[PDB]
Write a protein that binds this ligand. Structure first.
Ligand SMILES: *c1oc2c3c1C(=O)O[C@H](COC)[C@]3(C)C1=C(C2=O)[C@@H]2CCC(=O)[C@@]2(C)C[C@H]1OC(C)=O
Length: 872
């Protein structure tokens, strides 16, 4: 290992934010083993990607043009403005022309080596190239909807050389003996403050979040060291242990409640049975009383303060689990009319609905019949007795013939269901991933965060899903960019999965290319520098007192030093990679008058071809985990895409928001916007006597032109409806006025989500909102009626994708929540979506929620004010 190799590893660890070679918190070589195994997948993808297309990362879609965009185009034509220097001409092209047919058509119009130029969006690293109709480019579709013009510049294609990549005994199943483990003792440096506590150890053999067998030790006084030296034998036979099963060890604390836990994979990555002595440091349960963290094979790295449990496993030779080999029978394709019909009723049931013992027997007995319907796969494989060798073997025989599933249409919702906490079998999970291979880059982008979170449900570090993500990231820069940040936010805030995520990110970084490696370095530099600034200014972490003029002046000064000669002169915006930020506009920079004192920063665009002088407003938030906001915003983007397929535009505004490290992140500053509470405070003040006409007045004053005002109101009508529906389905509608913003164009949008007997409301639809829509009293109106229709429309449209939302919601709660979630928490979504109900009842249900808000008036906002502002 030369200084070079060591040096390279060093920088990668800096980009990752974790030392991927660290072995201070491992009891085996699974992680290192995974690093080695990911080497081939990475190299294979690197050598298979096109050097030019990878360099210009065209952002396209194969989806049809939405109904609301079809209107925007007159006669299959599109106008584009091409620039040179100041030199610029406007051309009219066909919506189906390829960027090549464009340039060739440009050289013929204006005329007085040759085709060595490329079309790039003005002021952005976004290229319109490749054999694709101009109308199938995301930027083109964006401009259309926004009504903005399409300005492209004629520059030289980026040399793909800049993406250069650096140089690169035997026992079988048979073991009729029952599995057993010995609990030696538990040890903890410091113990709780009640000192009359009792504790016992519970050992579970879990699979797919289900307990196959459980054993417990007797209760003993809770002291720094508690020894048992007792053997716990389980009712399951060694030969019946399925690959991916875990020995879940938990400690309960009572008086004389789960408090500590740690897991250990029974069958390792090499198909060998786990044996030997083990000293495992456990995690402490925060929820005094469930989630992805409880399934981790990772141990707590903090040895000096955590609880550890010492156990002993059977130590003989080396029993190895034999990989299945499909031989072939009873397909039994016929059943009684009633039986058949009651089988289809079980399958037709929603995800959250539990299966009874009898329900599972029918599904399993008629496996092959159930196999004919993809939507039955989750229920079917959840009816498999995974704790039985014979049954599992039969399960693989069943999956052998997957022609029906192989030909089935890609159903993202259905696929995600097989990648959650309920399935630990590699074969079942692998078939879900098989289907994901069909997703085009644009769709991978919509579900990327969710897929990354799903890696937490994988029993092993190396899996089909982890490799899938690696591959798509290496194949497309935009996906690679976001993958980088999503993995980095987990590695920095999650000790439960940081080791596994670090291995996956290192594999991506060794194949993304020199150019991207340089971009990531600059972005990370700015974030590290900005973070230290928030750490150097000690008062920034003090919520007790307000922000003085001296601290702000101190902020401007420190930003000045950095900018002199140390801070990157330009970097890509984490949440908007196509945009390059340049120098800071120290004058407009400051410390927000917020309790959390976030940095309000403004930069200039580093791209000179930018057709504007507006700054890039970025909030550098510190002291807050922004992972939940990212999840909420992404689910909102998913709702947008869902509404797009149903041909609907709810005008949501999922602004940029990305966690960039440990309790730090960057948030997009929406231009020309203010808080609803702010608008109220200007007229009234620091009191709860809210006026109903303030909002409308504010909007009109911002839109003195007839046409403009009605355009804004219509926008308000849509955006208000979109958020009411969206926030209601997610169960986060009852919010304080200061968490809702509005732009001068009338766009309403919720912000600052954070970790989210009395008066309650389903969502925010206050008198000021109803006012803008021309409704004062309890009387209807033209705009309000529209509002009601749009709400119903968007609402029903979401129900058409119930299973998708249900699974997305359950995973989000399980992976993006500190505390433990229950079935009750997940079931909320099922009720909010009126599952089982007919469209009619559903339409009325939502309309009823709209009525609750009218009767409530300002009541709820007034209580929020009394609480949040007056501490009442
Ligand atoms: C921490 O989520 C957000 C914010 C915070 C915070 O503590 O203060 C404010 C919100 O105060 C109610 C932050 C910085 C803001 C946003 C946010 O999501 C908004 C997202 C869209 C937008 O324009 C932002 C950046 C405004 C910003 O609020 C203010 C009052 O400047």
């Amino acid at each position: 290992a030369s200084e070079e190799t060591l040096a390279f590893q060093r920088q990668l660890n800096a980009l990752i934010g974790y030392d991927v070679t660290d072995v201070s918190n491992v009891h085996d070589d699974e992680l290192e083993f995974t690093r080695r195994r990911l080497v081939t997948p990475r190299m294979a993808e690197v050598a298979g990607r096109d050097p030019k297309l990878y360099a210009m990362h065209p952002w396209v879609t194969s989806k049809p043009l939405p109904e609301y965009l079809l209107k925007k185009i007159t006669n299959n034509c599109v106008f584009i403005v091409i620039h040179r220097s100041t030199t610029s001409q406007t051309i009219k092209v066909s919506a189906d022309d390829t960027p090549g047919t464009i340039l060739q058509s440009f050289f013929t119009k204006m005329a007085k080596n040759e085709r060595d130029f490329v079309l790039r969006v003005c002021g952005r690293d976004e290229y319109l190239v490749g054999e694709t109709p101009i109308k199938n480019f995301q930027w083109v579709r964006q401009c259309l909807k926004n009504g903005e013009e399409i300005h492209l510049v004629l520059d030289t294609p980026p040399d793909p050389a800049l993406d250069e990549v650096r140089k690169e005994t035997v026992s079988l199943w048979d073991c009729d003996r029952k599995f057993r483990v010995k609990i030696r003792g538990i040890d903890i440096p410091v113990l709780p403050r009640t000192a009359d506590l009792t504790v016992f150890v519970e050992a579970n053999i879990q699979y797919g979040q289900q307990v196959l067998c459980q054993r417990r030790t007797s209760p003993k006084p809770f002291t720094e060291e508690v020894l048992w030296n007792v053997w716990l034998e389980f009712s399951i036979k060694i030969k019946d242990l399925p690959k991916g099963a875990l020995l879940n060890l938990q400690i309960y604390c009572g008086a004389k409640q789960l408090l500590y836990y740690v897991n250990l994979l029974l069958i390792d990555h090499r198909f060998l049975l786990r044996h030997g002595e083990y000293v495992l440091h456990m995690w402490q349960l925060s929820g005094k009383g469930f989630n992805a963290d409880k399934l981790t094979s990772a141990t707590n790295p903090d040895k000096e303060n955590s609880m550890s449990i010492s156990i002993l496993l059977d130590n003989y030779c080396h029993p190895i689990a034999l990989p299945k080999h499909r031989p072939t029978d009873r397909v039994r394709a016929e059943m009684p009319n009633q039986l058949r019909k009651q089988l289809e009723a079980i399958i037709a049931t929603d995800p959250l609905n539990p299966l009874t013992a009898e329900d599972k027997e029918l599904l399993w007995h008629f496996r092959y019949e159930s196999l004919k319907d993809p939507k039955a796969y989750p229920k079917l494989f959840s009816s498999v007795k995974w704790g039985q060798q014979e049954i599992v073997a039969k399960t693989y025989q069943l999956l052998a013939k997957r022609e029906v599933w192989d030909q089935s249409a890609l159903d993202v919702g259905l696929t995600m269901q097989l990648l959650d906490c309920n399935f630990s079998d590699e074969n079942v999970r692998a078939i879900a991933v098989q289907k994901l291979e069909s997703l085009e880059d644009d769709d991978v982008l919509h579900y990327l965060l969710q897929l990354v979170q799903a890696v937490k449900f994988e029993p092993y570090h190396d899996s089909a899903l982890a490799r899938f993500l690696l591959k798509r990231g290496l194949r497309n820069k935009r996906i690679g960019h976001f993958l980088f940040w999503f993995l980095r936010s987990e590695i920095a805030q999650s000790r439960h999965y940081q080791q596994r995520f670090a291995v996956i990110l290192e594999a991506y970084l060794r194949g993304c290319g020199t150019a991207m490696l340089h971009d990531f370095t600059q972005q990370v530099q700015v974030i590290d520098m900005l973070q230290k600034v928030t750490i150097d200014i000690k008062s920034l972490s003090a919520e007790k007192y307000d922000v003085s003029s001296q601290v702000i002046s101190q902020l401007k000064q420190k930003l000045e030093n950095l900018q002199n000669l140390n801070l990157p002169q330009s970097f890509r915006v984490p949440y908007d990679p196509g945009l390059k930020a340049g120098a800071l506009v120290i004058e407009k920079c400051k410390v927000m008058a917020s309790k959390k004192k976030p940095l309000w920063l403004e930069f200039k665009c580093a791209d000179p071809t930018a057709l504007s002088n507006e700054t890039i407003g970025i909030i550098f938030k510190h002291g807050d985990d922004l992972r939940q906001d990212m999840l909420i915003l992404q689910i909102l983007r998913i709702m947008e895409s869902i509404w797009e397929t149903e041909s609907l535009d709810l005008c949501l505004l999922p602004y940029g928001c990305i966690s960039t490290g440990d309790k730090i992140g960057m948030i997009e500053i929406v231009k020309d916007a203010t808080t609803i509470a702010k608008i109220q405070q200007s007229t009234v003040g620091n009191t709860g006597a809210f006026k109903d006409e303030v909002l409308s007045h504010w909007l009109k004053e911002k839109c003195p032109i007839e046409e403009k005002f009605q355009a804004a109101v219509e926008r308000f009508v849509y955006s208000c409806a979109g958020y009411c529906v969206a926030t209601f389905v997610l169960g986060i509608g009852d919010r304080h006025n200061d968490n809702i913003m509005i732009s001068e164009t009338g766009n309403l949008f919720h912000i600052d989500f954070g970790h989210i007997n009395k008066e309650r409301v389903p969502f925010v639809l206050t008198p000021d909102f109803l006012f803008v829509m021309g409704t004062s009293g309890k009387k209807t109106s033209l705009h309000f009626q529209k509002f009601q229709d749009v709400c119903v429309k968007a609402y029903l449209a979401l129900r058409h994708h119930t299973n998708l939302l249900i699974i997305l919601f359950s995973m989000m709660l399980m992976t993006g929540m500190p505390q433990l979630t229950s079935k009750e928490d997940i079931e909320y979504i099922r009720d909010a979506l009126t599952v089982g109900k007919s469209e009619e009842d559903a339409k009325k249900y939502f309309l009823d929620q709209i009525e609750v808000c009218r009767d409530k008036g300002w009541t709820v906002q007034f209580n929020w004010f009394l609480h949040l502002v007056l501490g009442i």
